[PDB]
Design a protein around this ligand. Structure first.
Ligand SMILES: *[C@H](c1ccc(C(F)(F)F)cc1)c1cc2c(cc1O)OCO2
Ligand SMILES: *[C@H](c1ccc(C(F)(F)F)cc1)c1cc2c(cc1O)OCO2
Ligand SMILES: *[C@H](c1ccc(C(F)(F)F)cc1)c1cc2c(cc1O)OCO2
Lengths: 114, 114, 114
């Protein structure tokens, strides 16, 4: 899994350890080892949600499997909770795109997975 | 719907009103209330298009429905028009990825739209 | 095709000529004329891979066809090779997402490629 957050929240408002927490919590939620988890946070973005420039976030979770109806609800509760608690972004100003990747379409270490 | 623009145009060349203009125009084009629309503009990017560093844009439009052959051809006119006028980008230096999202794969407000 | 690299490597470590090298190498690898190729490099990112902030990269390759099992392996060797040689990023700290795009979902110059 790979999780990306883009947000208009400033860099100074991202708390120390945020990437570590995302890594740890995503490992728990996906059942994948922490070593596999990639996390990417992009603050200070020029963005709007519903025509308002109040704090918001646009995110993606790519995973080889572990994506589906109930699972995605659970990820959204977890991730919106974190963005609310840590970045002070209201859950209703977050979008998260979920992508179930075929292993053959993920490159790593000079090759691809299967 | 969610619209993202990555461009090598500098930040000071992005008009202050561009996010709101995109929001309004996309609401009309998709038939969704403006409140649903998220927009994200990423200037000052290191990019090349056809081996040239002249102004260009790499974009995406994600939507739960309202994506298809004819609709996409129409969106491209709308979006190239906006980018040409407001960012001075030639329309043949714009790519737009269109993604039709399943509601189950869009997280929002601690859940998903499924 | 469009290739995007997001990396925590600093801007100054990205060699002059990198975008041109990517354009040329992707033209060769995909068989598509260089005029069609878009490349985008995003340094100085806040990211972690396996909980570690050592150099890493999260990448994507979108293409209308020329995507598949064996081809993706070849692209990964090529692109990890370039990231290792030019940006000093170890291949096992790189993910690359491959997307086979429908021509109807690629917008360019007021239309799509369908
Ligand atoms: C994590 C993972 C990282 C990146 C992607 C990508 F497609 F976005 F590139 C997808 C998944 C991951 C890593 C693995 C793995 C499963 C997952 O989910 O099995 C071996 O390494
Ligand atoms: C807009 C919309 C925003 C984001 C995405 C995402 F998947 F990329 F995250 C997709 C669509 C939208 C919001 C809605 C809605 C439909 C759309 O298209 O119905 C209720 O809220
Ligand atoms: C390259 C190409 C660029 C961008 C995308 C996008 F979908 F991500 F936007 C996809 C492919 C390309 C350009 C062409 C072409 C094929 C490809 O692969 O035929 C005409 O121009």
């Amino acid at each position: 899994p790979m999780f990306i957050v883009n947000t208009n929240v400033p860099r100074a408002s991202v708390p120390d350890g945020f990437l570590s927490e995302l890594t740890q919590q995503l490992a728990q939620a996906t059942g994948k080892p922490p070593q596999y988890i990639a996390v990417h946070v992009v603050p200070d973005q020029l963005m709007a949600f519903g025509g308002s420039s109040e704090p918001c976030a646009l995110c993606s979770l790519h995973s080889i499997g572990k994506i589906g109806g109930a699972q995605n609800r659970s990820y959204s509760k977890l991730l919106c909770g974190l963005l609310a608690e840590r970045l002070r972004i209201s859950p209703d100003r977050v979008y998260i795109n979920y992508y179930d990747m075929n292993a053959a379409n993920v490159g790593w270490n000079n090759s691809t997975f299967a």
